[model samples]
Target chain A: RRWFHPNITGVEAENLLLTRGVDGSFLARPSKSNPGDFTLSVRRNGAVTHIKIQNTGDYYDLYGGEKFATLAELVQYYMEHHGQLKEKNGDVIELKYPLNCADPTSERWFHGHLSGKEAEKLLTEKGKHGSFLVRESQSHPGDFVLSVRTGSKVTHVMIRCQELKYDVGGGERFDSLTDLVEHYKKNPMVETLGTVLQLKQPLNTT
Target chain B: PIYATIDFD
Candidate 1:
């Protein structure tokens, strides 16, 4: 498969919330969002195709709207684009069943639909559709895509704000979400974040 | 679990 990316910078802004965090990786008060911060990429395997991108900000029912979708919807997208196939030889013609979709309701899957040209247009919009706020639209060409690897199945999808920032009260003492979660889990009622590698883990799911 | 943060400094 092949892929490409192009980006354009936007206006200047500041992020006061990030400065409070002590983590140097995020050491700096990340740059503010820009409207033109956007990118587009395509993924293709042999004869099949797919489109995708990384969504940055918040849209009513888009980014972090706490919306939900059913399994049938996700499965339909994949089966429609790429049909069922199985390999017998080093190179086989077709496979038996379709790729099984996992945790399709994941907040991550939102970005999957964000693929294609139409999604790119919506993402290019400054703060209207679902652009990230603060350094609001200020990041680089903010988008990406994926190809359904027959060898490795695609799972729940999500977003990634590269030069990311975070803050709570004043200064953050730890590094990633796990570090912060471990340190504070014993203390009080608090929210947390962690990477959801794949929902359809073998032995675990099925 | 690798049990570590890649972004951890």
Candidate 2:
């Protein structure tokens, strides 16, 4: 009877969408119009529209559809039923992160903290943070999913006792990020873009 | 290098 959603929310989901070049063509992101809500932006017949997730008693739905318990469940059905979701350039809308809507704003985030204590508040008071990845490990108690914000696109990888690493889907292997970056840095003549603004810089940065 | 599952996150 209670509505449910995942733990990935807010700007984190948007960054993932934009990283895939999805833009505003497809659905799935923390609803900018409504905090603590998910949005599905879709286009059909030259008209773009926004669908907000809301309480369905079972879950939220803009249209009178089957009730879903979670946004992930709702999105799964939407993508399956509404086929041919493509951008203006004909790029098919793809999902890179499964459970991408799982965000910290809801119980889903607390679900990961099974350390017998609510520990996230120790790190944040208002519950807003950036992109983070979680791996299960413990020096002793095994409570925390150590998070880091590399801001770099990622893929699964395997590392041997002493072997090269490569993107799981297949690409050139490298021993380290430096190895990969050094190659691109020398060959492509990459230029780093810099932005400068006048402001009272006291950690007022994004 | 892994095996174990949690239902929440």
Candidate 3:
């Protein structure tokens, strides 16, 4: 999981979550008190909360909560099912954004954490027919969206990652986003309504 | 067990 920062301390985790991340952004790291345990540091209400994760060789859980086979699964469950995770006082701990560690590649076209509306605004306002960018999907965590300016409008394509391979819903899975973008750049993708979407000039996030 | 809380005050 990209949100897992294996080597960071609680202090560093808080710094990263607060400074680089917004409210509901979070990351998982090894707990300082317990050797085999982990901590989920989340940013909320201008403060950071550290939740203990128990790894009992067989399963992972949030102390007295539900169990999962992996830490990523545990995190994903809480993120998707709202109100399922809460504090003792009944306050909900919402997990909206998975605080990204770093960009997988140094590609300028990858705009991490940008929302769809923001992407559409950026693409349509200042972009041409073939300008495009890749951003983290807001609705679906762990997935990416490729927003391209097709004529006067922007077309967003979902990029699915299964077993570490990236693909745009169908045909030709790539090892990395860079490879996928490179392939799509050469061979333009055909939209459902018979519209050709090109990836010519990358709307770089620099 | 209760979870650990980190406060930056």
Q: Give the count of colliding residue pairs in each prediction.
A: 17, 8, 0
Model 3, residue A19: what's the lDDT? Answer: 59
Best by lDDT: 3
TM-score of each: 0.16, 0.30, 0.52
For residues A118-157, what per-residue lDDT tens digits would candidate 3 score against the true structure? 9999998888989999999889887899999989699999
Cα RMSD, each candidate:
23.0, 18.1, 14.4
Model 2 docking grade:
incorrect
> What tens digits encode model 2's per-residue C-alpha lDDT throughout A1-206?
11122333433333333432233334455555556566664433333344555654667654344668877677666566543333344444432223333322221222342221223332233222332222222332322232322223211112111122322123454443334333433432211342211111111112
Query: Which prediction has the highest DockQ against the true structure?
Result: 3
Q: Whole-model lDDT, candidate 1?
A: 0.23
Reference-based lDDT, residue A187, model 1 = 38
Better of 1 and 3 by DockQ: 3
Residue A39 in candidate 3 has what lDDT? 90
lDDT of 1 by residue, B1-9 (tens): 001111101
Candidate order, lDDT descending: 3, 2, 1
Q: After superposition, how far is residue A181 of candidate 2 from its true place, in Å?
A: 9.0
Model 1 ranges with Cα > 4 A deviation: A1-165, A189-206, B1-9
